[PDB]
Amino acid sequence: LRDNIQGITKPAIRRLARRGGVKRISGLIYEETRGVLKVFLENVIRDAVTYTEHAKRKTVTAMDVVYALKRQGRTLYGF
Amino acid sequence: LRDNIQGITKPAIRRLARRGGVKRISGLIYEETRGVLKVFLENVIRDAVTYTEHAKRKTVTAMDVVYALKRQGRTLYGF
Amino acid sequence: TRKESYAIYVYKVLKQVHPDTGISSKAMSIMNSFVNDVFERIAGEASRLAHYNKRSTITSREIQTAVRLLLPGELAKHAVSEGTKAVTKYT
Amino acid sequence: KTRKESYAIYVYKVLKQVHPDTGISSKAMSIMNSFVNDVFERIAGEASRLAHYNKRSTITSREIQTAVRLLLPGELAKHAVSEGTKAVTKYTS
Amino acid sequence: RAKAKTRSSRAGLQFPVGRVHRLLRKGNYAERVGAGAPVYLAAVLEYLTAEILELAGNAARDNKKTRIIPRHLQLAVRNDEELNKLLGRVTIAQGGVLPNIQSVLLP
Amino acid sequence: RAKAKTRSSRAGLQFPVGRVHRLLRKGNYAERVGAGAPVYLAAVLEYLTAEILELAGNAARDNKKTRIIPRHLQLAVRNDEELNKLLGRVTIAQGGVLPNIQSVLLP
Amino acid sequence: KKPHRYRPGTVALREIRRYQKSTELLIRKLPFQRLVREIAQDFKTDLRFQSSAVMALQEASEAYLVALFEDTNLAAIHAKRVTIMPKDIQLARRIRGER
Amino acid sequence: RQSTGKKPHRYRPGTVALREIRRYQKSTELLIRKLPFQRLVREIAQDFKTDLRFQSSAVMALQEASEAYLVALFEDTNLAAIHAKRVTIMPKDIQLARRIRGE
DNA sequence: CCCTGGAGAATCCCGGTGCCGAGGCCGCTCAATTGGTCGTAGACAGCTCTAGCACCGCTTAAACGCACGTACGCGC
């Protein structure tokens, strides 16, 4: 699995900024948003990996991601 | 005790901005900084008041202030 | 197995406050996670409050202090009044 | 009088172990003690949470290892895990 | 063995006092848990639940909806200032954000 | 009985294993505390303390002072990126901040 | 005839109004899932993910990115601009403490 | 109630400001005075509960925490000022920083 | 209008005091250490079965790219 950071396509970032009320979206901010998303995922998924490793499991459940987001002050409801 | 919000003097806010590396300090920053400090104190001192009222004490200790700063993600060391 | 859930109590509270509205599975799951997270927050605050003053017990004053520490504004006072009313009706 | 628990002499001994030519003031000592208390509370709470989420009643060395991987980031966490593993292997020897 | 009456009915409440007490006991939170602590906790949870569901019903009536959808719950949470400050560190799934547009963005 | 050898010397450690175990037992964290958990906690605490004190000693030597002052500890925390991420939400008294100047500030 | 030729900004406002009231997920499910898989491959080669775990990760990432975009837009309006910039994102991360 | 009522130095702005920045950034002592901050603390506390006292060390901890928080807020405000192609901070920058911080 | 030489003032290195907080020492006592003893949570073996991994049709809304110009980013 390589070059999946391009999977977050340009209209996806367009829609994400439109949800946030952005008027104009630059051409250079897509790479920056991809990097920010990569950093956030490399934190949260790594925390969930540690949770799954401690949980004696090889499959990352939604609950482990839930407290992985909770421990960083970003608690998510509904899972 | 009245007009105690002016105890934080204008050169005190100027020196606080100098510690933060602020180049130029506007004349309208002092009232806004006093209001922000008043809001922060009205949160922290109220939390310490609740902490002291819980422990059946009449004066507030530095440990309760440390707890009130710690519960909001602003933990203080040395007290 | 049996899994603990807060669906029916939230449902009857909803029927008490608004009997003309329903709820979905996703809305129920959001409400369950919200009430559980508030449970852990208030219970942990009460546990820390007991640990600060070497208190071996958690009373209603622990929950009231946790509510005033967590809930801001008039919400904390309303919750404290509701808890006091429930305590007086309990005895 | 009343004996209050503190890590003043322990942090002082650590300082003399790693830097045998310097001293430390009481304000810096209290800052280090508060840092030790906060890190101890954070790791203990993380280990208690990890024990609770797996429906387990005890806290083992793996709980502390997961707590220091979750809290400490990166190479600091890897070095902490290595030091903890070395201490566990020395304690059980 | 007399008649089994729940503590929620004696306190005029719908949330379970006994389940809250059991979760406090097995939650390793304290050595002892008082009698009034689960009653106070259940009363606070009941008040918060009633307020959130009432605001969600108001938002659903504003959207011509008679079923509570997580969009309505997100609108109810973010519309109230106290709920927004309390749940500032809260992510809500399938809720979006408020439909607010800045003044300079309008043409 | 036998010699009362401390658990810190048995594990090659300086932080008290027994004090950590006692604080874990009375700290309302778990029903039981394992054997290796206080050793792991003391090892992590000693490594963090040693790294922070070494960085503070280096900062004191840059300032050429013998005694460690809170300015040295604040510089040690803020200079290390790992310590900056670990203690981002930490306020250190009597320490100030980093003496850095923006590029456009200088004339 | 001539085309309608919408001025720049009107379709932006229409999309803002549409997405600010719709709760659908903007990021496609499979590319985000595969990005999650290659990110987790650096930590564990033999790992699996539940569908609801990917759902929770997608929702949390979408909400975090939307909040970051809101802060970026507010900083852009603060900086006499209407176009979001990478330096605005860097400022928003530095103020929030994530940079 | 009963009353009827040769050439001077002339330092340009900015250089002495940077001098003060360098002097106070490497400094350690407290910038805010003790008793005005203490009196403000008592005045704020008297609105919540009367007949309340603060010890010297609690006032010290509150003063240092408030100074650190305001220094971080001023750092973010100056960063937004340079971000907005400016060297002078505005209260709207402070409001923007508070909004981004979530408070 | 720009480059270079001379001097006013905040800042930095250094000699001398000493002093008041830091380092080392005396007990000793209360928390740390040793041994046994069980209830019991936890490590391990076998079943399974329900949800996840991989590939396939397909079709269709989602996405890359090119042409054009006017709101806006940037220089003055």
Numbering used by the authors:
A (entry chain P), B (entry chain T): 22 to 100
C (entry chain V): 29 to 119
D (entry chain R): 28 to 120
E (entry chain U), F (entry chain Q): 11 to 117
G (entry chain O): 36 to 134
H (entry chain S): 8 to 12, 36 to 133
From the manuscript:
To test this hypothesis, we further introduced an acetyl-lysine analog to mimic a previously known Rpd3S target, acetylated H3K9,22,39 by mutating the lysine-9 residue to glutamine (K9Q)26,40 with the aim to lock Rpd3S at a definitive position at SHL + 2. 3D classification and further local refinement of the Rpd3S–NCP187bp/MLA/K9Q complex indeed results in one single SHL + 2 class with the Rpd3S complex at 2.65 Å and NCP at 2.55 Å resolution. We named the 3D classes of Rpd3S–NCP187bp/MLA at the SHL + 2 positions collectively as the H3/H4 deacetylation states of the Rpd3S–NCP complex, and we termed the K9Q-locked class as the H3K9 deacetylation state. The H3K9 deacetylation state obviously represents a snapshot of Rpd3S deacetylating H3K9ac as the introduction of the acetyl-lysine mimic H3K9Q locks the Rpd3S–NCP187bp/MLA/K9Q complex in a single conformation. In the H3K9 deacetylation state, in which the deacetylation activity of Rpd3S was confirmed by the nucleosomal H3K9ac deacetylation assay, the active site of the Rpd3 subunit is occupied by the acetyl-lysine analog H3K9Q, whose C-terminal region lies on a hydrophobic trough formed between the conserved underwound helix of P786/V787/W788/A789 and F795 of Sin3 HIM. The Rpd3 active site is ~58 Å away from the H3K36MLA residue at SHL – 7. Considering a peptide of 17–25 residues could span across this distance, Rpd3S may be able to target the H3 N terminus from this location. Rco1A AIM, which adopts loop conformation in apo Rpd3S, changed to a helical segment at residues R384/Q385/L386/F387 and binds to the phosphodiester backbone of the NCP via R384. Because mutations of Rco1 PHD will likely disrupt the structural integrity of the MRGA-PHDA arm, the ability to bind to the DNA linker is also compromised. Both H3K36MLA tails protrude through the gyres’ minor grooves at SHL – 7 and SHL + 7, fitting into the conserved aromatic pockets of the CHDs from Eaf3A and Eaf3B, which engages the local nucleosomal DNA at cross-gyre manners.
